Amino acid sequence: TLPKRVKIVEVGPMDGLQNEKNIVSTPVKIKLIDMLSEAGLSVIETTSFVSPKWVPQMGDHTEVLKGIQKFPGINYPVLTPNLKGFEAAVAAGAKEVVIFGAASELFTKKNINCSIEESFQRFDAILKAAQSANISVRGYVSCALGCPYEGKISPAKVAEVTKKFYSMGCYEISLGDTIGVGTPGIMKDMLSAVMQEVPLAALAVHCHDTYGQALANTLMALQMGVSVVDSSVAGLGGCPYAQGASGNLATEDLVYMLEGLGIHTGVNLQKLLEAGNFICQALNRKTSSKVAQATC
Amino acid sequence: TLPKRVKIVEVGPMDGLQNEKNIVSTPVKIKLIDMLSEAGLSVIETTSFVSPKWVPQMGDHTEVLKGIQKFPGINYPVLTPNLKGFEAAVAAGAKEVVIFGAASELFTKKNINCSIEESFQRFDAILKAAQSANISVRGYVSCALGCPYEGKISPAKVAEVTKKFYSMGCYEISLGDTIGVGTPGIMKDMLSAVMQEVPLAALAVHCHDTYGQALANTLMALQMGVSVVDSSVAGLGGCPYAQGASGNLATEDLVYMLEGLGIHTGVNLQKLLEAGNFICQALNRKTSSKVAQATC
């Protein structure tokens, strides 16, 4: 049951850059996002409102959100790891925020020292204010296809966390294969359990290509009815738990497949590539997009 | 559903090496092949008995075929473009040969001035001589998911050429996405037509990753029932009718996906990665395998 249209959620400026060695100037970030708007993306994760102490690449969050062109119809969600960060996002003009959890206790104890139920106490406070402030919230679940610490993750657990997020108010939850270890059957089992508890349209998948399974895992999710998928431009954002291995699924390669499938994205591939090439040069790296390599 | 087991046809030493910039000595080729046999591959395309004047990277075809270890139960098919090559292969001990055509008239004309019909006349003689000699013949249909000159290729046309190879005597035919422009719908349509005319067991798929669609296209074929797929060790072998992008699908990334699916391949991933790293250093190139890059 392939969807007729898919909403590609671009994470290059946030997830992509957050996971890059060399940092980039604020003006380069704004230009990247503007170019992405130019290419037609309907949603571009813009930045993260979190201390520069924890993640310095996102330190310019306030001015980035303020300086980017706000194209009609385009969404620019931002990450808000804690009540204060959310507080700052609203002030900076954010119309949508993003909270992130995980289906793994260990991974939670490493990423935020707290427990899983505890991280939900934190999230409840944000969703609450978010609801008063009239701010839509998107959830994110890490280790949905496996954890670097705990290893195998259960479809029931992923379904449980996704369920929690959805009932607290999240309008859409993105399931992420952070270490990119998932294969098709794993994806199908996970999505299948989740789909019992949470309606299909509120689901999204974020697959890493560390082991070259991102597009394949994405295809499987699409065949299961999922209509929103996350990706980063030139495949930006490597993996912390791997060597010099690739990171996110390259958005250009994803649009290529979707267009091949005759599936609507609304993205202009030629402009998408310009954006990809613009940032790779600024970063002084090589695009991870195959489409980009075969194209020029 | 999916097959319980897949026969991986390794083409690195043949299709891969031929399409690689630098060349490696005869002993290196022999060692690479021995390393693949040790890794568990059941079929390893070994070399091509073609004029050295035309494809010099395969010039050592006789000594290479004679010098590799012949592991029990393992097949070492070699390419024989014409009758002279076939006769040279037989005289050198070949037990299986491979012939190649295309589902594209323009592609055939620019690579042999003969139409698709005429190309089959040249194969007719080889097939007769092969039957008389008790030698197996695998067929290969390039540009099955598109052609660099004609563009889109009709499913029915691919079905027609494949049926021709089969009725002519080929026990198996590999359908190759020569330029890697394919997407799952295209793969599904082509296979659907081919299957009306040829039994499932006689089919194989060979997807290039020039556009990042190799594994996804391969997955679609597995979902259609195909149980044999061609791949190259470290994604060796670029694409001529393309740019500096990659070529073949990395066997390691294929095995990784198949293991995750719980599909038997009888291949030892760790030993396959050793083979990859070995030929890569001999070629002074970085592996195209994602599994390899993230495993070390």
Curated annotation (Swiss-Prot), chains A, B:
Changing residue 10 to K: In HMGCLD; activity lower than 5% respect to the wild-type. Changing residue 15 to E: In HMGCLD; reduced activity. It is found in: Mitochondrion matrix; Peroxisome. It catalyses: (3S)-3-hydroxy-3-methylglutaryl-CoA = acetoacetate + acetyl-CoA. Pathway: Metabolic intermediate metabolism; (S)-3-hydroxy-3-methylglutaryl-CoA degradation; acetoacetate from (S)-3-hydroxy-3-methylglutaryl-CoA: step 1/1. Highest expression in liver. Expressed in pancreas, kidney, intestine, testis, fibroblasts and lymphoblasts. Very low expression in brain and skeletal muscle. The relative expression of isoform 2 (at mRNA level) is highest in heart (30%), skeletal muscle (22%), and brain (14%). Pfam families: HMGL-like. Changing residue 206 to A: Loss of activity, and reduced proton exchange rate. Keywords: Acetylation, Disease variant, Disulfide bond, Lipid metabolism, Lyase, Metal-binding, Mitochondrion, Peroxisome, Transit peptide. PROSITE patterns: HMG_COA_LYASE (PS01062), PYR_CT (PS50991). Residues 6-273 form the Pyruvate carboxyltransferase domain. Its EC number is 4.1.3.4. GO terms for cellular component: cytosol; mitochondrial matrix; mitochondrion; peroxisomal matrix; peroxisome; protein-containing complex. The keyword Lipid biosynthesis does not apply. Homodimer; disulfide-linked. Can also form homotetramers. PANTHER family: HYDROXYMETHYLGLUTARYL-COA LYASE, HYDROXYMETHYLGLUTARYL-COA LYASE, MITOCHONDRIAL. It is linked to 3-hydroxy-3-methylglutaryl-CoA lyase deficiency: An autosomal recessive disease affecting ketogenesis and L-leucine catabolism. The disease usually appears in the first year of life after a fasting period and its clinical acute symptoms include vomiting, seizures, metabolic acidosis, hypoketotic hypoglycemia and lethargy. These symptoms sometimes progress to coma, with fatal outcome in some cases. This is Hydroxymethylglutaryl-CoA lyase, mitochondrial. It comes from Homo sapiens. The gene is HMGCL.
